[PDB]
């Protein structure tokens, strides 16, 4: 298990670590998060108590370095940093653990939620969507726009998700206009899977990362991308059976984790009704359809 120590907590803040969250008071003796499960990416996120518009966080993998958080009073945020001195880092963590100044990552043993939400998410793929090559971890916040949002403004601070546009020459073969518009299989299988993503695992990884960014940071463009990647599959008549079965599992755990009270801001009525009841795959997502109908019947 790995540890993200905090130098201090000078401003009151709600800290998230993956699907968990806890409140830290102004100048409370908080010095980090221990017992973080090795083997998964993680996200540590922040929402300031005195200013809820400050929503930002960091994706990281403890296998890639020793990371800590320190508040910057000039930029007014908690910053992730890497500590290259291993023995210094260990010495800091040990002192904080001995004084019990850390919260423990509160993973129930029965509980596969985080694995189920990040099965296909890799840190290397995150670092290509979020471009800041000098760090091993990736900063995301509420307001970051996507490359596609910027085409319809600072490019360095953007989310480089794969652009999906159903009325684009990439999506529509000349001479196959009706075919490709009513059946997105060409666009899914040849353009996206064979061409850009290379395999379904990378496609699902980006889909999963988009969902998590939208939910944890209230990022609109991430929400748009998640829905577009769902709709591209559901609107394709020809999808490998293993991908349909895996998508059903991916979406089930996403809908299960979504806060009940955020459904008005995280779920697109049009897309979900189209996907579950009108699309080629309307009968292929049995688990997702069942949880959606029992948890968010209003949306449908």
């Amino acid at each position: 298990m790995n540890t993200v120590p905090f130098t201090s907590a000078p401003i009151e803040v709600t800290i998230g670590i993956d699907q968990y969250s806890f409140n830290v008071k102004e100048n409370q003796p908080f010095h980090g998060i221990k017992d973080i499960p090795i083997g998964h990416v993680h996200v540590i996120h922040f929402q300031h108590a005195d200013n809820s518009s400050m929503r930002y966080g960091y994706w990281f993998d403890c296998r890639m370095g020793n990371f800590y958080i320190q508040y910057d009073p000039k930029d007014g945020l908690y910053k992730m940093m890497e500590e290259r001195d291993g023995a210094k880092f260990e010495n800091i963590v040990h002192n904080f653990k001995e004084r019990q100044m850390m919260v423990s990552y509160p993973k129930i043993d029965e509980d596969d939620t985080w694995y189920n939400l990040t099965e296909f998410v890799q840190m290397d793929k995150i670092r290509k969507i979020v471009r800041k090559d000098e760090n091993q971890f990736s900063y995301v916040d509420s307001s970051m726009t996507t490359v596609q949002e910027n085409e319809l403004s600072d490019p360095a601070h953007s989310l480089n998700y794969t652009v999906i546009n159903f009325k684009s020459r990439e999506a529509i073969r000349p001479g196959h206009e009706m075919e490709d518009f009513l059946d997105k299989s060409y666009y899914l299988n040849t353009v996206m899977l064979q061409g850009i993503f290379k395999n379904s695992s990378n496609y699902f990884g980006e889909l999963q990362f988009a969902f998590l960014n939208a939910m944890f940071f209230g990022n609109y463009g991430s929400s748009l991308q998640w829905h577009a990647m769902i709709e591209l599959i559901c609107s394709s008549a020809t999808v490998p059976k293993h991908m349909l079965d895996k998508l059903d599992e991916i979406l089930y755990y996403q809908i299960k984790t979504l806060p009940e009270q955020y459904s008005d801001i995280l779920l697109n009525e049009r897309v979900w009704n189209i996907c579950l009841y009108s699309s080629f795959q309307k009968n292929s997502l049995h688990n997702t359809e069942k949880i959606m109908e029992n948890k968010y019947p209003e949306l449908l």
């Binding site: 009325k167 684009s168 020459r169 529509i172 000349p174 206009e177 009706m178 518009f181």
Partner: protein, 237 residues
Amino acid sequence: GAMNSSNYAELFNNDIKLFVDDTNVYRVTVHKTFEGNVATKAINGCIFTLNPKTGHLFLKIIHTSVWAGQKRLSQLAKWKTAEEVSALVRSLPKEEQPKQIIVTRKAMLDPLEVHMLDFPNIAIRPTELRLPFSAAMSIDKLSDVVMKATEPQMVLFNIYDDWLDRISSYTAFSRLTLLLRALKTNEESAKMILLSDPTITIKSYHLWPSFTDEQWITIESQMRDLILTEYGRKYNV
């Protein structure tokens, strides 16, 4: 965006534009079969593509053979329409290509947008005008060429005959829409109005009779009366 009464003079400015009406593309008769089921029989149709400034009508005749062995014909008809309008644009010299295509039915927007992806600077717009272009097939010479067709064909007409020698395109379009609305509302009476007087004829190279200016005023009044008469009959007014 959408084309309505506020921006109506835009139809007659110097930006080339076309209306596309697909109502008469897929046309059927419905009938009982020997076993007492119901079947359709397609008949020849047409795409009505009109430049409202010049009167140029590109009438693409849709021969029933294009439906043979196809499914979901009402859906296919929209896409065939879009395919044919796209092909027409590509066939025109650059300086004749439209800057805007206005579709009379919003279901044509996505098919036309998708077929015109190669022309990002041609705007595809709906309209809030209720235009009576479905009644094109009430114009005898148009109906005749459509029904006689044995193969796909494009036929070029000027739907204003020679009116623009005497009136503006705004007025010509108003006259056309009044005539077509009247033909749509009561075709027999409208045609009686247009042909009642044997001494006024349709030139070989025209669609409508050769009315003088004063006769057009009379005709237009008779068409408005027909429309109002039929409204009163319909709604018991």
